[PDB]
Design a protein around this nucleic acid. Structure first.
Ligand code: ZN
Ligand code: ZN
Lengths: 76, 118, 135, 91, 95, 305
RNA sequence: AUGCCCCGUGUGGCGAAAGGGAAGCCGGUUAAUAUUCCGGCACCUGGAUGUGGGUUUUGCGCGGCAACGCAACUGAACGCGGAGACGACGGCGGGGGCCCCGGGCAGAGUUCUCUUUUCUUCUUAACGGUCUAUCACCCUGGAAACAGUUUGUCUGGAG
């Protein structure tokens, strides 16, 4: 697992063809949003504070890549 | 809580290749985790001191890391230490200089012997 | 008397250039605020010319005749002085403390050192200086 | 504060082995556990590694010597005699 | 004789005791005499002899060890080599 | 600026050269900081803009905190106090770089060969000098403050290390391809950097994009000495090299900051003379105008308009 | 390159599920297997071949006094060295886990009387990034009125 500190590098990671999946995790107790992208070798996590930048990044992401919001319970 | 643990491999004996350490898992259990032996630092080829700048790893892990991580930018770097290289340089220089001096004195003695014979 | 003077040939015993032969461009016995010890300003040969043979073609001869130089500020404790002396007129004041401060000046000085040393080598003197030390 | 009147280093052997044998082992044990001055570096750090082997902790030199002393009187006498026959042979 | 000369030198003149200070004295060129003990390592002995040949200073090979050289200088420590920079009232140079 | 008249002068440390001069960013002080050798001189120059009220305000801000450790704040000599210099700060080694915070309460000094004390933060009100970061990988060259956030940039020969001052932590490492970083500057927006090097390469880094240069360019034959952005809304930045020439660049940063910035060379400024293989050493921009002043190894400063 | 040259060192195999040794963790799942299945997240070894970087128009990178640092840093034969790779016992120090004590949330039990009570959960893996961690080594300097220093008396003009 690798951490991305910055949204643009997160965007070209999502633009890469290795980018298998993408999800949004919201931590309300901590007041933060993590954007995670799963690629061929690594899972990249970008941590952002509560801002308009998360929702604006959500449309700024590629549309072919499926973006999913993490539910409260990870059901099997 | 269950605080007692078991081996996770079929070797039941406390040999040197059966080293473990205790972890606590996110499931809340205490468990063993089998670990490898501790690597050791490369030693100087002349005095046997530990060479600074070089990692202490198991022998095959040196094939995975890059060359500047395994060397020091100096002659004999990664084999000999700086003090031993310095003694090598000084000793080499002094001995070849004394060889030149002895050759010159031998030529003088040969010339003196030739003059005495002639 | 003092032997660590200008044109004195020394051997470097510490650092990246350990074992290389240098010539003292300027001795600073009293020291400097940056280097508060007896030090020297030297120019040396990082890569010596290769050995050449009477049977070699001319083009191979100038190919195996290049010299890679360097310039250094060096502590006296890391120098081994030699009885040899290298009188070069093109090496007078090619470096100073401001040269080692200014990175364009030092790479400009290295070109002068390279040209002067290659000219002296092709002239054919100071074979001890232009041969490497075996240690 | 002297703790034993006569046994010294042989006090580890207790009342065993006999007085004469404890006194005989005491000499060699003292002279083998003592520290000596190095003839190469001048420091008092030469100690016995194994039988016949004497090493210095400072200058890292290893010497071939006696079993329980760093030198043997027969070897010293040989050194003197070998010197004198060396000037006899050379001159 | 050499011990009495060293005693007079310690009493009157100026010396530095030790390898690094002796090397600095030889580099400065103000060294008048260099004393090297018998059991000094041969590499250091050859280096100091080369330095003295370059600076044209005389070398005396003291027959004793570093312990005996320190005792001759009047110190309670060992000394492998030393540099006399000023003879004082002694005549150790005139030899 | 416009006339070229020399209204003030003072010899600070005699033989020691003045490496860096920086005005305090606040309009209300008119306080100049200079570095000569190992010393920092904080002074109020005798200028026509200085009124008695302005001089009194500047004086009380300079000496408010009055009412071996890193940094020795002291009053200067009597002649220096008569000339107008009011503070001298002594550090361990020779200072090469001064940077001022935008509020004017702190200034940082980079002194190469200062080892662990290479980068020092000085608080003027507290009269306090501290070393926040002891170990930095390599020899420090330059420092700067982030224009909008409590971040600190330290340029080493190889890397530019970005630090959060509140947590005193390392938040980013920026990797130019240079062997030796000569200088760097930060965009007023705060997300872009220009890095100039002795390897004749000018590098545009976008901090959101990568840790490696977004743009790599080479317009000079000789080594680059200074880079400087324009402050005040003009999308200009200048590059100063040892060949004695300035290069003026149009660099526009989009406001949405998810579109890549645009860099176009617009001008070559020549006529500055090279002496002893050194050309233009420093560059500065006007606060509101497209005018730049360049320092010279020939001994002249030049204003280009 | 219808032959020639170089080198010496010998001789193969079997022999350890406790020796040596490339690399996997957590959670879940079955009536019965699980570091093997599922989910998530990794690693090692071997191979082929691109792109981006590095070097180069003077072919084989730069910095630091140094210990050495830096994403790379031309390297055939022939040699040198290091790791693998090593006894028993004793006290001392660091780390993990367990044991112990206090507060707080939630739950449970006791409650003739007492008990702001007694007990239970409060966890964080492999693998990475970053900052740190004793010895050891380098620079300056030259120590007696000897000093530093361990529980244990060693170290220092050979600094
Ligand atoms: Zn060594
Ligand atoms: Zn010894």
């Amino acid at each position: 697992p690798q951490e991305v500190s910055d949204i643009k590098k997160f965007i070209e990671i999502c633009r890469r063809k290795d980018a298998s999946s993408a999800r949004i995790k919201k931590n309300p107790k901590t007041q933060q949003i993590k954007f995670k992208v799963r690629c061929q070798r690594f899972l990249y996590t970008l941590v952002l504070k509560d801002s308009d930048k998360a929702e604006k990044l959500k449309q700024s992401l590629p549309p072919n890549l499926q973006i999913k919001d993490v539910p409260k319970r990870n059901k099997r | 809580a269950p605080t007692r643990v078991t081996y996770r491999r079929r070797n039941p004996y406390n040999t040197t290749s059966n080293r473990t350490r205790v972890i606590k898992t996110p499931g809340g259990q205490l468990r063993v985790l089998h670990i490898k032996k501790r690597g050791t630092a490369p030693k100087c080829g002349d005095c046997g001191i530990k060479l600074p700048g070089i990692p202490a790893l198991r022998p095959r892990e040196y094939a995975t890391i890059s060359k500047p991580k395994k060397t020091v930018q100096r002659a004999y770097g990664g084999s000999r230490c700086g003090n031993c290289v310095r003694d090598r340089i000084i000793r080499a220089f002094l001995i070849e200089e004394q060889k030149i001096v002895k050759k010159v004195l031998k030529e003088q003695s040969q010339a003196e012997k030739k003059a005495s014979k002639k | 008397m003092k032997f660590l003077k200008t044109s004195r040939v020394c051997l470097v015993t510490r650092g990246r250039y350990a074992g290389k032969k240098v010539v003292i461009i300027q001795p600073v016995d009293q020291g400097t605020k940056s280097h508060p010890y007896g030090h020297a300003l030297v120019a040396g040969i990082e890569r010596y010319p290769s050995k050449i043979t009477r049977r070699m073609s001319k083009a191979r001869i100038e190919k195996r005749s290049k010299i890679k130089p360097f310039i250094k500020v060096i502590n006296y404790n890391h120098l081994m002085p030699t009885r040899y002396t290298l009188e070069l007129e093109g090496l007078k004041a090619v470096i100073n403390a401001d040269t080692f401060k200014e990175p364009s000046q030092r790479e400009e000085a290295k070109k002068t050192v390279k040209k002067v040393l290659e000219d002296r080598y092709n002239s054919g003197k100071n074979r001890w200086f232009f041969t490497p030390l075996r240690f | 504060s002297k703790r034993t009147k006569k046994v010294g280093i042989s006090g580890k052997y207790g009342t065993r082995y006999g007085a004469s044998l404890r006194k005989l082992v005491k000499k060699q044990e003292v002279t083998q556990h003592a520290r000596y001055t190095c003839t190469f570096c001048g420091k008092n750090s030469v100690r016995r590694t194994a039988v016949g082997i004497w090493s210095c902790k400072s200058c890292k030199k290893t010497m071939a010597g006696g079993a329980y002393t760093v030198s043997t009187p027969a070897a010293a006498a040989m050194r003197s005699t070998l010197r004198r026959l060396r000037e006899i042979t050379e001159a | 004789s050499i011990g009495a000369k060293l005693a007079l030198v310690i009493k009157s003149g100026k010396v530095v005791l030790g390898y690094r200070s002796t090397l600095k004295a030889l580099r400065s060129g103000k060294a008048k005499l260099i004393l090297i003990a018998a059991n000094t390592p041969p590499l250091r002995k050859s280096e100091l002899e080369y330095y003295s040949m370059m600076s044209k200073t005389p070398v005396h090979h003291y027959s004793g060890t570093n312990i005996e050289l320190g005792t001759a200088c009047g110190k309670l420590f060992r000394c492998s080599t030393m540099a006399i920079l000023d003879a004082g009232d002694s005549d150790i140079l005139a030899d | 600026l416009l006339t070229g008249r020399q209204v003030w002068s003072v010899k600070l440390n005699g033989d020691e050269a003045v490496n860096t001069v920086r005005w305090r960013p606040t309009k209300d002080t008119f306080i100049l900081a200079a570095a000569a050798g190992e010393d920092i001189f904080l002074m109020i120059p005798t200028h026509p803009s200085v009124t008695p009220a302005l001089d009194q305000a500047s004086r009380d801000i300079l000496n408010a905190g009055f009412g071996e450790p890193p940094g020795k704040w002291a009053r200067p000599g009597t002649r220096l106090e008569d000339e107008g210099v009011l503070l001298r700060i002594t550090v361990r080694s020779t200072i090469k770089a001064i940077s001022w915070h935008r509020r004017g309460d702190h200034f940082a000094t980079v002194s190469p060969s200062g080892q662990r004390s290479s980068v020092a933060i000085h608080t003027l009100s507290k009269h306090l000098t501290q070393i926040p970061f002891r170990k930095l990988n390599g020899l420090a060259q330059t420092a700067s403050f982030h224009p909008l956030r409590p971040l600190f940039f330290v340029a080493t020969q190889r890397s530019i290390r970005c630090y959060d001052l509140q947590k005193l932590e390392l938040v980013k490492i920026v990797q130019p391809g240079a062997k030796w970083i000569s200088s760097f500057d930060v965009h007023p927006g705060g997300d872009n950097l220009v890095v100039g090097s002795y390897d004749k390469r000018l590098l545009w880094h976008d901090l959101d994009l990568s840790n490696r240069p977004y743009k790599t360019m080479r317009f000079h034959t000789e080594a680059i000495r200074a880079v400087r952005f324009h402050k005040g809304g003009l999308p200009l930045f200048a590059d100063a090299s040892d060949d004695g020439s300035l290069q003026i660049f149009h660099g526009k940063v989009p406001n949405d900051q998810l579109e890549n910035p645009t860099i176009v060379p617009v001008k070559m400024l020549k006529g500055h003379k090279v002496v002893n293989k050194l050309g233009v050493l420093d560059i500065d921009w006007h606060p509101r105008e497209p005018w730049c002043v360049s320092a010279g190894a020939d001994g002249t400063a030049r204003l280009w308009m």
